[PDB]
Amino acid sequence: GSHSLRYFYTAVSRPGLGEPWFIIVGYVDDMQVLRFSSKEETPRMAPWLEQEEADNWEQQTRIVTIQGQLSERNLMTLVHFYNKSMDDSHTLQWLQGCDVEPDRHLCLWYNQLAYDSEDLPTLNENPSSCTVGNSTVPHISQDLKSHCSDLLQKYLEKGKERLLRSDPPKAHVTRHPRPEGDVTLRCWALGFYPADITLTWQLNGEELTQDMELVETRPAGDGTFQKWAAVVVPLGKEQSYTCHVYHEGLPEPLILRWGG
Amino acid sequence: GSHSLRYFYTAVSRPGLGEPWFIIVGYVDDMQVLRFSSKEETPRMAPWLEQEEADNWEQQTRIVTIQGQLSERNLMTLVHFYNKSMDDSHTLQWLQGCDVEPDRHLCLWYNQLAYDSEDLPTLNENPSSCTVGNSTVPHISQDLKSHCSDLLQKYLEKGKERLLRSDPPKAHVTRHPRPEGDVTLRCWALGFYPADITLTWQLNGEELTQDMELVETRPAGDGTFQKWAAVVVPLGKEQSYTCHVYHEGLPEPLILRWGG
Amino acid sequence: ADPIQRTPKIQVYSRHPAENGKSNFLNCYVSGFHPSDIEVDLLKNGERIEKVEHSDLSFSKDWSFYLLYYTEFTPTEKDEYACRVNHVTLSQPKIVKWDRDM
Amino acid sequence: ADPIQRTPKIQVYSRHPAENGKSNFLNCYVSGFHPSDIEVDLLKNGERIEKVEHSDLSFSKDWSFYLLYYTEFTPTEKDEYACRVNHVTLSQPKIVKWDRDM
Amino acid sequence: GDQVEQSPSALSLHEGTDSALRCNFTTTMRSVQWFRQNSRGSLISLFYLASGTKENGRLKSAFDSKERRYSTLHIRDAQLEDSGTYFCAADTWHISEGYELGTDKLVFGQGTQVTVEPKSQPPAKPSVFIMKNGTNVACLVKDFYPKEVTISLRSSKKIVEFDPAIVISPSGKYSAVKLGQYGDSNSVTCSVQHNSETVHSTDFEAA
Amino acid sequence: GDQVEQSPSALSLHEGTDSALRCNFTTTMRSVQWFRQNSRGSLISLFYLASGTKENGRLKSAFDSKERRYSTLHIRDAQLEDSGTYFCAADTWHISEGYELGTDKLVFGQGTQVTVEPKSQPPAKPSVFIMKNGTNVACLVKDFYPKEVTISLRSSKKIVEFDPAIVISPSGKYSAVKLGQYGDSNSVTCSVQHNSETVHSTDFEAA
Amino acid sequence: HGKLEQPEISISRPRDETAQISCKVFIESFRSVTIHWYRQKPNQGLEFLLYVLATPTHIFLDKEYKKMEASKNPSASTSILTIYSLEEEDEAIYYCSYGEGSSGFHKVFAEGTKLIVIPSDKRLDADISPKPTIFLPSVAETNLHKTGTYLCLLEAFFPDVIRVYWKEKDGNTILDSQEGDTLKTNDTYMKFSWLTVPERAMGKEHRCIVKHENNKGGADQAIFFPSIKK
Amino acid sequence: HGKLEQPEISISRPRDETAQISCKVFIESFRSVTIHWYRQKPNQGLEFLLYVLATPTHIFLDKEYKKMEASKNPSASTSILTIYSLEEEDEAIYYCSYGEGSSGFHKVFAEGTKLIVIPSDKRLDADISPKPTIFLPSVAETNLHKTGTYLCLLEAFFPDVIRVYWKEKDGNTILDSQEGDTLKTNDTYMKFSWLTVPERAMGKEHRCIVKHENNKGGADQAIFFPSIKK
Ligand SMILES: *[C@]1(O)O[C@H](CO)[C@@H](O[C@@]2(O)O[C@H](CO)[C@@H](O[C@]3(O)O[C@H](CO)[C@@H](O)[C@H](O)[C@@H]3O)[C@H](O)[C@H]2NC(C)=O)[C@H](O)[C@H]1NC(C)=O
Ligand SMILES: *[C@]1(O)O[C@H](CO)[C@@H](O[C@@]2(O)O[C@H](CO)[C@@H](O[C@]3(O)O[C@H](CO)[C@@H](O)[C@H](O)[C@@H]3O)[C@H](O)[C@H]2NC(C)=O)[C@H](O)[C@H]1NC(C)=O
Ligand SMILES: *[C@]1(O)O[C@H](CO[C@@H]2O[C@@H](C)[C@@H](O)[C@@H](O)[C@@H]2O)[C@@H](O[C@@H]2O[C@H](CO)[C@@H](O)[C@H](O)[C@H]2NC(C)=O)[C@H](O)[C@H]1NC(C)=O
């Protein structure tokens, strides 16, 4: 199984109160694991984490802070290069992270920023590598790029319970008919973990990919996601429509028909 | 007062019928003086032209006929130049002719062709002049461009009555009530030859030219043309709307009013 | 559509002032259309009038085509008339109801 | 020049299959809005529920933002709930009725 | 007369660049032709058209009827086998004395001479050669890089010298010969200096 | 320097002519700048961009926002005063090992030697005069059109003669000058053969 | 061997005289032909001159009081371009062409022939033909690069445009060789070409097929590179 | 008289020795400015080298722990590029530039400086500097055109890097002149440029101005050109 750590830096300006606003949520897969903004001396990491008296996260503490810090200049040198009136609020989004996968010794370093809503041309070929090899020892290890993997490791190890886990989707189908002659069948998926869930309506034969109502997959406050997809079924047939649900947890693609 | 003569050659394609279809109407100052087509051996000239016993003028007949023969190969050649399936009806419209008037010794000749309604890039500049001829040099040769100044003057002396005339406009307005409350004032003009005529409604000294109703100046069918221009007018303001009917076969502006 | 098409402008009318009772000619002047072949016929109270001669097919500077039809009929204040015209177009044939006003 | 703004999406629902009587949490999810300055309040049969917490501001691939406001509520067959979200992108605060299925 | 205008009076490209020739006239035409003149003077037709787009290889001629008065010819991945003088030309319907729908004369443009120079990639070293015989001497070089070159000379009895001549080898590099009328009846040698590095033709002569 | 390709390596046009210079980069670029540096002087600057397309005087050029990888520069109604080399250079945001959103390094294309040659023009007849300096006679050929030219100085004890100088005159015609050194200096008259005719310095010197 | 051929690359004839330029057509239906003649100056386009009806319409070029050039179509199956009263500005390259198609042009052109105007200075002084002198591959190249080069340096002529060309004699197949530009020699010209001998097939002789208006005899020079023993 | 300009235009210094270029800066914000340095090779385009921070905090270029150059920024409101371990592929044109105060960019460079690496000569002792040779107008021309042209001929100079403009020295301004490309004199270099003075301005004194490194004293040449009436 692949894995990916992410940091979401987000900054905003308002009048000339100087003090810019900012947060740095840091996730691992769909579990947020790190929070840190303005008005916090320490990167407040997620509770559910085996902690062993170790002020040994500094490297991550160091990085984040700075990032938060330059938010002052950064967010500013970015107004003039566009000479946009410093009276209209602005924002600076930044994202770094990597997706590791040792089974293939793979690592991809991401690093994207965007001003008001437009990306910023950077020298980077956004997706790049994070495994460096020369025949030496010294270095300056303090680039979030060179630890992302390691950090991912830390998180994974120090969290194997919640992070390395699969909570399958529990699924039911509801029949709540509509006014004008055609029943509505809603297929449910509740509390499944990785948000990636793909639900599908069909007729033994094919799939109804082109005529469905799909809610973007929403989150429930316990660390799980829920999604629904429904369609208009004739009160007669009403059953030659199955709900094939696919997910990481359940191997055997779940299939749903109504009660009987 | 420029007088003139033109021949409108017209040829068409028929989905594999071997021989095409075609015609050659000819006119002078809006009056038809000649004619020719396939399955016809001769130029049934204008009855109104009582020429004397022997037809001393047919070198133009030489011209036309070959044009008839040649007509085919052209539609032939035209078809391959442009990628075009010989299964789709095709047509080649051609027009040659010229103008005339002493003062500046006016004599311009028009020679234009069109494939399926498409001006065909002829190299020679367009409206070309033609009044001169070397000294001691009869140009009896095949071309029509050199027989204009000759053949025009020929047609205008063997039927002068119908080509030297100027039937002025007989105009009158007409009231027709509008269930909507308005009233249409239709200014007719009948019996006039020099087709180019212009009617016009004025309202307090201001021509209503672009905001009035007008009909394509259609042909009586006996020798002259008819045309009427109209308007919608307040139930009452009638006697205020005038109808200027210009035309040079009328010394000064013919002006009408009408209503009831 | 690639073959430059042009749809006909139709006018139906009396050669002279219509005074039902005596002879005159019924005219249907089609012009402004292009694709040569055109089916123009006369009508009386609904049927197809006959023995109608047409004009010497010529064109305008815009390479447009124009034809004139005309017949020898006796005008009466009770015989509705109209022109029958159909050619390379979209909808069904076009009939033009003759009217006193034009 | 003209900034590219994106309106907020809203989804109000129960954390768990709601059953009036036993407890559950109310969730008003918002997503896809760009300018992060946003106002979100829940309502118990009409008014702005006392205290509701929400997640830490994160965004997605297209930098759009997303936040979910959740609260502790005890669904009760005859008590309606809904969401109030006001953005720089809309006419008046939008209300989102919470139906038990969707 | 005057009614045609070719784009660049001359233009030069690198191996693998992409450019285009334009040329227009406003006297409506039937078709625009495109040619390439060899050094031999031969006229090589490239494209032919009376309607829109066409393509083959890298050359593509573009002509369109919104007026039928302007035509363009672009070049993609320009390769050594392209340089030459390009011409646009236009023909138009010619009407006989009779009525044979023929074709009027072809109108060309001024000359836009293309010049396609080679890609630049890790150099190599120039191997000189000997060519002289009878009061005549001319150095040689096989596949070197820059036009930058100076063919030195080593003769006993000197007279005036002449101008060289650098062609473009097959591989993709330059090459050249520098004429020289000297003596040394069968004895001569060559010396070259390029890129601060010199090379004696002697440095290769063995026994 | 592995990320910017300048379209034309070379280009030439007559006045009134038109053209474009393409320039694309091997990496996302934030702002683009187009320079033009004459003979051997400073780099004048024509445009600065970060998105869009600006047009000054006759020149127009652009960077297409959504791509951030291609820049174009056009020259309309070209004119002699547009000769010289054009350069396109762009840049990109950088990020320090400490998140300093800086941006310094400026990449340049390989450049383009734009040359504007004069309108096709009815041949011109020179005017030839003679500048002097004991031992030094200079031949000045004036305001002549077709560049094709042959200048010769008739002298007997000729010391050293230098090649000729042929600069595009002001008015768009061609002009030339040629020095050399001589003994018979005072005698020295200059003969010019241009366009099949012959013009003598002598032909003008009044007497 | 052709669709339109034009012997005699160049033709040089004294001032204010008449000149002969003709292209031997090779296409039957030679009668229903229309041949256009074309002129190309130094650095100009290519302009039109005339058209022949492929049947001696004797279309001639008359320009206000003057008959300038003639178009014709004999039995030798060729059309000849006659040019009267030669003056310098008339000095340029001439092409003969026609249009493949009843209604079109694949436009077929010929090699073309450049007319050379010559004032006074000689009465056919000397011969004025290419003067060969071959050069042997370098023992230095063979030895170190196992490669060889050979050439045919000419001289002593006046045929301005002499276009050189080689091809593997045995299987005489034109093979692009390379040569340098034409340099002047006190009002005489002389080019120098050469080749990159296919490393392993260096035998006794390949051929340096030269060709010019004024060249001994009147045939393309056949030049070889013999071996040695002395 | 300047926004940012460099002193000398050419610099010829020894192999394996030090060469430092200079660029007079003219912006009071000085202490808090950033000075940029690019280099250029024969028709290639500006290549970046180093930036000079707001005042010192000097930056330089090591080639694997062996410095190649270093930008500096002292009191005399100017920066400086040094170059140690001199070699040929180090000879080019060096330019200075600065980026607008509050992160703006209409990037400005200077005239630049050509860095000539000179080999050897006994002990390099010879007067290699410009050497005039004035030529006044030609009466013919004067007489017939009511014009006057001058010739500014410089020879026996070395750098081979000269700039020569004809300034109407009665008043500092430039006049459309013409000039011949610089020709190489066996071991030196030479050059000329003319000026065509119109009628109503023939009465004034014009001076041709030469600017070249190795030139006497160390200043531009003052070449005055009379103006007469007869
Ligand atoms: C170097 O000088 O090049 C010249 C010119 O190419 C070589 O000259 C000769 O000898 O080349 C061949 C080889 O001997 C000669 O060909 C022969 O001799 O031609 C005559 C007919 O006239 C006949 O004997 C045979 O047909 C031979 O093949 C040729 O005639 C010579 N060229 C001339 C015109 O002088 C020369 O050999 C070469 N030098 C060396 C050392 O290789
Ligand atoms: C032609 O012969 O060229 C020569 C050499 O260039 C010209 O010589 C002089 O006169 O050029 C200038 C102009 O007079 C002289 O400059 C002056 O005279 O220098 C002295 C200092 O020694 C001083 O009086 C001023 O600084 C002047 O500018 C220069 O000295 C002369 N050159 C020499 C070394 O003889 C000559 O004028 C010119 N002939 C004509 C008719 O133009
Ligand atoms: C040739 O350059 O074409 C232009 C006409 O503009 C172009 O053609 C149209 C059909 C489109 O392809 C469009 O992309 C182009 O704009 C002529 O160039 C000049 O056009 C100017 C305005 O665009 C006009 O002000 C000038 O008078 C006109 N000529 C000049 C002074 O260069 C041009 O005439 C055509 N041939 C040439 C260059 O001689």
Ligand SMILES: *[C@@]1(O)O[C@H](CO)[C@@H](O[C@@]2(O)O[C@H](CO)[C@@H](O)[C@H](O)[C@H]2NC(C)=O)[C@H](O)[C@H]1NC(C)=O
């Ligand atoms: C160049 O640098 O060197 C040559 C050779 O030394 C110089 O040639 C001449 O001109 O030197 C003197 C001076 O005129 C003459 O007496 C010799 O005959 C010439 N040498 C030969 C054999 O050509 C040449 O002058 C010099 N160039 C320059 C511009 O100074």
Ligand SMILES: *[C@]1(O)O[C@H](CO)[C@@H](O[C@@]2(O)O[C@H](CO)[C@@H](O)[C@H](O)[C@H]2NC(C)=O)[C@H](O)[C@H]1NC(C)=O
């Ligand atoms: C650089 O110049 O960018 C241009 C424009 O995107 C590329 O142009 C071309 O060649 O891109 C593709 C690839 O060949 C073609 O299909 C397009 O037609 C063509 N674009 C146009 C309109 O010119 C260049 O290829 C690219 N340069 C390099 C060296 O990559």
